[PDB]
Design a protein around this ligand. Structure first.
Ligand code: CL
Ligand code: CL
Length: 376
């Protein structure tokens, strides 16, 4: 007998798109640490400043596999991590274009800034050249290599400094004098880019009226959600610098379940096109996306709930296979523990115990209102 701890609007289903060379694993470990306060898990339930953040693990393929399409549906937004040295590899391009097809909003994080030969401006440049994406910097790093001392937030128009310790973050002081000219130059470039995404901001810009910090964030978000803009951040996941800012950007610019289109399905035995809105008032529907052999509970079946709610110990239909399944226990895999929940809601992710015939890609739904989300 529990209600939602976190609302739809305050939910972030994210995935991290990057190669092992770009530092995907080390980046992921930092996110799990900051989001789990007070071996690779298929999906990790976590939080950040009052928001539910589900970190969905993604594969490292270089092909047009069906597993990626499913991995892109399960997540709503994504964090594309680039290597500061190389920038954009030929294999990052194939991943990027697939995300664009399914309309996945993405923020970019230029990792390994403290590494030798790291160049932020260069890396940002490759996105517009190679990928042909409208990527823009919302940050400017203070120094490179071991001189990498801090990060400038172009939106808030402030600077943060890192002592390279466990404390890491410091208060938001004024931008250093030697970086002000470039900072305002990039901030004004950012403001112009955003003005082209919302006419209301263009009008204020042309009339000479100031654009507030929140108006700029809204514009960036609006553009990022429409897959027309890609905010670019910087940091060093290896020495823990700028990772918390990425989490802030997830809240600020990545979509909540309601910010992406309602998922499309079909009624079994017919060609009828159906849509399931991301809401609790609708009939339950969910997509299973990973079956893991757990050592304690034996067999976990991870699933993304698109619509409705589901109580533990209740039946549902595996519409893909035409079988009844009893969701015995519902678990959420946290960073350092497991939580058994009595109810899972729309736009959330959990693992069901007790399923017999369900496999990756199958649809689980309310027995009284059937739907198959994946084509077969
Ligand atoms: Cl940070
Ligand atoms: Cl909706």
């Amino acid at each position: 007998a529990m209600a939602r701890e976190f609302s739809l609007e305050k939910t972030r289903n994210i995935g991290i798109m990057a190669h092992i060379d770009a530092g995907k694993t080390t980046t992921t470990e930092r996110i799990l640490f900051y989001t789990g306060r007070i071996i690779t898990s298929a999906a990790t339930t976590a939080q950040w400043k009052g928001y539910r953040v589900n970190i969905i693990d993604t594969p490292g393929h270089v092909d047009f596999t069906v597993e990626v399409e499913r991995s892109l549906r399960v997540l709503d937004g994504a964090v594309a991590v680039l290597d500061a040295q190389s920038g954009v590899e030929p294999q990052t391009e194939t991943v990027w274009r697939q995300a664009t097809t399914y309309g996945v909003p993405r923020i970019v994080f230029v990792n390994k800034m403290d590494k030798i030969g790291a160049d932020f401006l260069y890396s940002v440049g490759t996105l517009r050249d190679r990928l042909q994406a409208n990527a823009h910097a919302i940050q400017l790093p203070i120094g490179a290599e071991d001189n990498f001392e801090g990060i400038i937030d172009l939106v808030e128009n402030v600077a943060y400094f890192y002592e390279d310790d466990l404390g890491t973050r410091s208060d938001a002081k004024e931008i250093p004098e030697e970086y002000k000219e470039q900072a305002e130059e990039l901030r004004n470039s950012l403001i112009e880019a955003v003005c082209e995404l919302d006419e209301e901001l263009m009008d204020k810009y042309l009339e000479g009226e100031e654009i507030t910090i929140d108006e700029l964030k809204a514009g960036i978000r609006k553009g990022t959600l429409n897959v027309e803009f890609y905010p670019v951040l910087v940091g060093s996941a290896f020495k823990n610098k700028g990772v918390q800012l990425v989490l802030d950007a997830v809240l600020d610019y990545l979509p909540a379940p309601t910010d992406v289109a309602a998922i499309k399905g079909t009624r079994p035995d017919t060609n009828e096109e159906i849509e399931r809105h991301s809401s609790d008032e609708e009939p339950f529907s969910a997509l299973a996306f990973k079956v893991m052999t757990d050592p304690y509970v034996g067999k976990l079946t991870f699933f993304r709930v698109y619509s409705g709610t589901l109580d533990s110990g209740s039946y549902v239909k595996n519409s893909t296979k035409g079988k009844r399944e009893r969701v015995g226990r519902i678990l959420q895999m946290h960073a350092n523990s497991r939580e058994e929940i009595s109810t899972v809601y729309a736009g959330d992710i959990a693992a069901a115990v007790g399923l017999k015939d369900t496999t990756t890609g199958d649809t689980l739904c309310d027995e009284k209102d059937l739907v198959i989300l994946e084509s077969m």
